[PDB]
Amino acid sequence: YELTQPPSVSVSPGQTVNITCSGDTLGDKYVCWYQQKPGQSPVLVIYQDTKRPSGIPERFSGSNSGDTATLTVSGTQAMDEADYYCQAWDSSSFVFGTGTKVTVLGQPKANPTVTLFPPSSEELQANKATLVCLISDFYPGAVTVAWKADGSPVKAGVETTKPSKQSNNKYAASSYLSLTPEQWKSHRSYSCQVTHEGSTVEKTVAPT
Amino acid sequence: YELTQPPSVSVSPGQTVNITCSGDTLGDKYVCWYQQKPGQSPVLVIYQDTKRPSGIPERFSGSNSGDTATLTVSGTQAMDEADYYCQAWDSSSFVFGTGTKVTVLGQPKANPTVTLFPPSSEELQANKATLVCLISDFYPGAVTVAWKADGSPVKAGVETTKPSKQSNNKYAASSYLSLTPEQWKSHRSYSCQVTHEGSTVEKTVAPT
Amino acid sequence: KPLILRDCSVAGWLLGNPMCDEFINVPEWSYIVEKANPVNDLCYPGDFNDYEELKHLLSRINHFEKIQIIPKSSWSSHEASLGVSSACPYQGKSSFFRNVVWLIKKNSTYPTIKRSYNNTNQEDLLVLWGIHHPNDAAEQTKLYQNPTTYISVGTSTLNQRLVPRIATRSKVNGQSGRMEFFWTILKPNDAINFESNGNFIAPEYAYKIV
Amino acid sequence: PLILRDCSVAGWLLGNPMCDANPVNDLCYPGDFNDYEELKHLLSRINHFEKIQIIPKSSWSSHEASLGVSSACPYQGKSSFFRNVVWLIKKNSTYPTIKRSYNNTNQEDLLVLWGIHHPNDAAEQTKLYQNPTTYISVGTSTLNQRLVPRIATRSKVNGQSGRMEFFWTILKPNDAINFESNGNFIAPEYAYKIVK
Amino acid sequence: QVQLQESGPGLVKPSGTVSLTCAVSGGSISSSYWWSWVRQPPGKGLEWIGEIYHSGNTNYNPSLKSRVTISVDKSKNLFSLKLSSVTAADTAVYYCARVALFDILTGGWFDPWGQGTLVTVSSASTKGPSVFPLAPSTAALGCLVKDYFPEPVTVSWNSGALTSGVHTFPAVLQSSGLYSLSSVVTVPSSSLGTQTYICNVNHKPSNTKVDKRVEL
Amino acid sequence: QVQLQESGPGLVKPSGTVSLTCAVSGGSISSSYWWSWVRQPPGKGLEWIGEIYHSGNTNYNPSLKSRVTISVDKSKNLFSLKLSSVTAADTAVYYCARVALFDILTGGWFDPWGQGTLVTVSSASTKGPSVFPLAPSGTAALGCLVKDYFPEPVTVSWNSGALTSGVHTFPAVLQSSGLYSLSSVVTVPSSSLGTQTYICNVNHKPSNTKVDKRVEL
Ligand SMILES: *[C@@H]1O[C@H](CO[C@@H]2O[C@@H](C)[C@@H](O)[C@@H](O)[C@@H]2O)[C@@H](O[C@@H]2O[C@H](CO)[C@@H](O)[C@H](O)[C@H]2NC(C)=O)[C@H](O)[C@H]1NC(C)=O
Q: Does domain A107-208 have CATH number 2.60.40.10?
């Protein structure tokens, strides 16, 4: 059983934000919601679809219908910026959603700049090959990176960092594709696709 | 349960017209009748076989026996020209008749002229193929259009407009047979049969 | 154990008035009595012949039991479920007394009914039946097809022939017609005979008494 | 003879999970048992008592017959319900109208039990049965019952702010019991053969 | 007098759900009446969908029973319709009506009706029309205005100069979800070679203006 | 108020066993609650491991059932977790939590959670990094790749601290080998390429690594 969430959502301070959670016949199950801030433990904000624990502000509310559960935060505040998870139960297993990052907009939106480096000639001599994709100067700090080899998706050998705040307060991230010299020459093209706020930017390198 | 009605009837002004409704063992059921004018809601004229609602003129009457119910309108007027439906109940379901269009003859009978257009040379290049059958200058405004491919009936891809009044007050209607360029060339002939007042007129086209 | 009625009258409960509010779990009773003033008597308006006598009779009774004597499905030439009225609603739709059957015409025909039930029990049977007095001639044809009709009920101690009085009457519970209900005590080994070509309200359930 | 300990008569008939005089537990999910005293009197003069299945739980192909459970009736640490009766709830986003009838073709009287759930609030009514306004119709040749669920928040008994009302009747041989409901129906699966 | 009023989304995408509500004024939902939904596709017959009683009791059309739901809100004095998994065949005008029982026998009559509301089932979005010539072999010629969305399209001939013998047919909704119509003009055969004919198609929703000359 | 507290090693060699214990305060284990373990790898989602009741009854995640065990000590008011045959994929923050049943329906909610504890699964030891040039192809971007070092941190400067503008040093990444890696980039005008020399200064004190690399064109 899978609970699907959007990876990230944005909301201006004072506005209302929606967090969705999808699963098969979710409307028959009771859903719960947890808030997690960086470096802290999850906090129950909504249990049993619509119920609030004591000490939880009234602006938090939840609902469930069909195959989609929704956490709603009205009059959102800066302290509400966190990761949010939904959870349900199915066949002797508790299931957590993939998680949604909620950003309260405190600065203008910035597009990411993408730089892709092919393996250096020196690394190839050491019988190694690492593709480096650098992502910087973007807001909010949410990003999806996808690697492509000859137009086909790549999962093996991909390692990616979590977005981190720069000095300017604009987030940055990096992604590495580790290959062998043989694998590197095997394909004719490689791509580093970076998705940020519905916009996808890619860079390309070719083995010569 | 099916309730069958005649598709159309004609009647001179001042004369009496009868509208029949047929179904299995209809004589045991109470039948109701509704008047509907174009773009308006149905209007109850007869309920419980013979009863008239308040505001309904006395010249309207109904009867039921055997397997056929009859709506009767004596001294018909121009304001009585409308569609009429019968209605009954059977096995937890309400059932409406197929409907009868009652035309009060306000002008001489006119035969329809039928023109069938093959797909245009421009449309075929746009990877489309539409046969257009145009029917015009006929009275009363009642028509049955049937499409044939190599003499065989066609229902799929058929769309037909309801008869509409021209400037001269003679009704017109149109029917479309939508095909793919492949489907169009597959057969050697296509036909548009038009039935009006017991008389059938047809036109034929062939891909050349 | 005694049967104390609430809201529903004796006639209403015996006939099986849908509108009767009563929870009832034990089908074994000694006797049956109604409240001094019943809220609903008959859902379809009409009269109950020898009502006072019947109520008195069902008071001093040692055992009261309900039994099915003529199954509704046994009417193979007539329609036993379609006949209903808005005066006796059930779950929003038209219905009828549960314990008696409102027979109406099947197709364009209402064949003459010849049915007889013999009391093979060891107890006296309380059998109820009725006649429908329709609104007008048009309704007579609509329900029973035949214009001039009759109901014949015979036992060893009873000889009855009924003719429906067709007349428009004031609307009670939305009905301009009426129904007249009759009853007799069928002794063990005695049989009751029914004959009708229309307007017959036939029994389905009777009551064993001691 | 069957001498019961700790569990009540109502508890044993319904199938209280912890159950298998003064009873510690009457109903695990809080509520009432109508005509309880009368039932006990009836179950006194019995020569033979036997349990029978009249409506298989698997026969509910359009409704959910196992998911509905409460913490008030625990079993092995997890939520459960009365064994002999079925807590029907919505399957997917739908609760189709129930029209079910069982006819007693045995030679003995049948003790049939059923119930209605009075949910905590409106939000719970929709969650369990989907349909907002609902009813239960129970009919025999001698019985006519129509129930409407009373939606109200009540004091927590066994952790529940809702209640259940249970009913019973004696189904005579050749007599049939009919059920109709679009929600809040706690349906019988097992009935009891009794002999005077 | 009792009045009934339908309202809801007039455009619904395929596999989606038609969601309608019927407001009742001048009377109470809590009556001996039943409340029903009836639909009618353009230029076709009436079809009973289902009904509901204030107690919650419902009855549906068996052919629709799989994907239909009817509920009632006594507090707001309305009842509603839900039709899921919709197709092009579900494009119709939807009526709500009040149903009254006969004094004797099953069934009832529908009075009064609501004004009705059109629900279009199409996955289409704003699109400009293609225009093709309907060339003649008196004679008849016209223009075919195909695959546009949504309504309406206005067609004139020679910039409004040619109006006699001109008939512009109603639009039809194809199974693809795109509308189509034609505009024809009947003319004498001898005039064909000596006269030029130009149709002027206009589709405001997409701001499309197409002029097409019909040749021989 | 009920408080839960995780405790355990935090460093585990591959093929070894992660052994954690959860102390329960403010409440008794012998309750109607269930007691659960949940883990989260860095920058990833929550994953349910399993649960236990005070009677000893358990339920596990089917994907972990092969190598996971959960026990409970009613007397010491704690419950514990054993995860054997561990890999780099088992490096995560582990939470213990209290689970309460809904009044109606299956399932439950998690409250309260423990503070959590990090368990690192890596056979890695102190290792020096390799340094490779990231040559460029209006401005241009060039950098240095600092690969396969342990442990943190690594500092990178450019032209011995003379060049600080346009310099961005990215955070480290934890590879599946258990070894860190990062990059340091600097954006410079394209025209200056060839008329200017750029040198990155990688330093990894734990291995006494001082590497200067000139990024060519
Ligand atoms: C967030 O979503 C709500 C939607 O409200 C409903 O609840 C959801 C859980 C889901 O079931 C939706 O399908 C529901 O519509 C938005 O608020 C609604 O907006 C609609 C207009 O589309 C309006 O008709 C409703 O009245 C609104 N309801 C409320 C309570 O405000 C809201 O706009 C969404 N916010 C964002 C930022 O997308």
A: yes
